[PDB]
Amino acid sequence: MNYEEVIKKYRGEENFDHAAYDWRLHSGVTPVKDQKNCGSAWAFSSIGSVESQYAIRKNKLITLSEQELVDCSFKNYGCNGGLINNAFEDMIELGGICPDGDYPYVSDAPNLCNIDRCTEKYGIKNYLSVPDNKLKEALRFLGPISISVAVSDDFAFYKEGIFDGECGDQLNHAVMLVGFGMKEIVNPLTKKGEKHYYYIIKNSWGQQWGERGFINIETDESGLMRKCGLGTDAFIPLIE
Amino acid sequence: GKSLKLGNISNQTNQETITQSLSVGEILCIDLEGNAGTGYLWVLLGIHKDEPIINPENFPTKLTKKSFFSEEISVTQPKKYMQLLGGPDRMRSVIKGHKPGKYYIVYSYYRPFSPTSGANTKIIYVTVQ
C-alpha cells in the first residue's frame, strides 16, 4: 500500500516538532529482548514492531513469540538470517503469532514449528514500506519502525550516549526505530550549549548492552541523515 | 598459505582445542565463523607456552587492538572477511612461525558486555618445526 495514502489518515494537516519524540514515553515500546547467539534479529525487529502497534492502537500490552517466526517462517532461515518483509508476509500467512509465554524463545536449540501452542493469537492486517526520507514522520504518526542497519564490531562496545564507532560495510542486522531526540552539548570554546540530534533505536542484545538495551545514533533535524545505512529497509505492521 | 576454518558455534559456554603442525616460516590462515548482529565478536586473547586455563569471567570488556608479534611467533587480531540480516559472518586471523616450539593460541567468540553468556573458545595448539 501507499505510504502517502496511509500517512494522510494519521498525520492530518498539523506540523510536528522534528527535535524530539520518544515512544518509550507514549506507551509505544515493549521490554527489550535478547536474540542471544542466533542470527534472528529479523524476528525480534518484526515482532517488536507488532507489539508496539498493539500497545498504541489498542492499549494492549502483549509480548509475542519470536521462536515461532524462527520455527515457522519458511521464507526465512531461522538462526541463520532472514528479511523483515518476509517476516511480515509470514505473520499474515500463519494467521498471527502466539504470545511468548505460550511459546518461549530457545534460540539455536532444535525446536519444531507448532502453531497451535496457543488458543488466542495476534496478527497484523498488512504492512507498509517507509520511504528513507520520511522516517521521523512515519515515527511521529505511525509508530516504531522495523528497520535494517549496518553494524560493525564497535556496536558491541557501545555503552552510552551517541554512537561514535565505525559503521558497517553492508546491511546486516535488524532493529527497531522508536523515536528521535536532541541533547545540547556545551561547547568548550563557547560555553554555549549546542543542539545535537539522534535516532533512538531498540536492539535485541538484552538489557546489559548500551543504554539498557537502546542506542542513540546521529541524525539531523530533518532525519535525512541516516548513519549505518539505517532505514534502508523500513516497515511498519498495521493491525487496524 | 595453509589454512583452518572454525567452528561450530553453540549457545552454551565451551572450549575446543585443535592441534596444528607447521614448518617454520609457513603461514597459517584461521577462518573464524559466526553470525552477524548477535553482539558476539571474535577476539585473539593470547599466546601461551603453558596450557591455558580458560576463564570468560576474566575476558576484556573493552576493545582489544594489539596483534601478537614476538621473536618466536606472530598472530593477528581477527579482522573482517534486500541484504540478508543476521547471516554468516566471516573473520580471519593470521598465524606465522619464526622459531621451532609449541604454542597455545587462544581465540574466543564472546560478548564484551556479557562474557559468561555462551562464550565459544578456540585453542589452537601449534607446533613450529
Side-chain angles (χ1 to χ4, degrees), chain B residues 48-110:
Chain B
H48 310 273
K49 279 303 163 56
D50 60 302
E51 181 183 45
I53 196 69
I54 303 307
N55 195 25
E57 214 97 15
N58 292 327
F59 295 173
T61 54
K62 301 180 180 181
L63 234 150
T64 286
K65 280 205 160 194
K66 306 190 60 189
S67 274
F68 191 86
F69 306 114
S70 76
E71 57 169 27
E72 308 174 319
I73 191 159
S74 79
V75 203
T76 52
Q77 284 290 344
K79 283 184 180 172
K80 308 187 165 189
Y81 164 72
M82 296 188 80
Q83 295 291 99
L84 197 86
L85 311 176
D89 163 1
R90 280 187 182 170
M91 273 197 140
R92 181 177 290 260
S93 189
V94 180
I95 300 171
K96 173 179 157 187
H98 297 142
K99 173 177 314 167
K102 297 304 185 309
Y103 308 95
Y104 286 104
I105 312 191
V106 183
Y107 296 101
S108 208
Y109 196 56
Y110 74 101

Side-chain angles (χ1 to χ4, degrees), chain B:
Chain B
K2 164 181 166 181
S3 61
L4 180 72
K5 80 173 177 186
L6 314 187
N8 287 22
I9 288 313
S10 160
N11 274 246
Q12 306 161 29
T13 298
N14 65 96
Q15 199 166 330
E16 182 183 1
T17 305
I18 167 176
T19 65
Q20 279 298 319
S21 46
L22 273 208
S23 327
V24 174
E26 189 182 18
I27 263 178
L28 172 58
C29 304
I30 307 286
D31 282 8
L32 299 153
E33 197 63 34
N35 272 117
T38 73
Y40 294 78
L41 56 14
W42 286 102
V43 188
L44 163 74
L45 287 174
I47 314 278
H48 310 273
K49 279 303 163 56
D50 60 302
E51 181 183 45
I53 196 69
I54 303 307
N55 195 25
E57 214 97 15
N58 292 327
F59 295 173
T61 54
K62 301 180 180 181
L63 234 150
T64 286
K65 280 205 160 194
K66 306 190 60 189
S67 274
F68 191 86
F69 306 114
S70 76
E71 57 169 27
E72 308 174 319
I73 191 159
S74 79
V75 203
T76 52
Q77 284 290 344
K79 283 184 180 172
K80 308 187 165 189
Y81 164 72
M82 296 188 80
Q83 295 291 99
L84 197 86
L85 311 176
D89 163 1
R90 280 187 182 170
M91 273 197 140
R92 181 177 290 260
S93 189
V94 180
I95 300 171
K96 173 179 157 187
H98 297 142
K99 173 177 314 167
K102 297 304 185 309
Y103 308 95
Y104 286 104
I105 312 191
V106 183
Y107 296 101
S108 208
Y109 196 56
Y110 74 101
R111 298 180 153 179
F113 54 91
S114 205
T116 45
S117 309
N120 289 244
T121 310
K122 307 307 196 216
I123 308 146
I124 315 316
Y125 185 63
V126 172
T127 72
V128 177
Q129 81 211 32

Side-chain angles (χ1 to χ4, degrees), chain A residues 108-126:
Chain A
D108 215 334
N111 199 68
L112 306 181
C113 180
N114 176 355
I115 79 183
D116 301 331
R117 303 182 50 170
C118 53
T119 67
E120 193 176 353
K121 325 203 169 140
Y122 305 66
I124 65 172
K125 290 192 167 177
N126 220 314

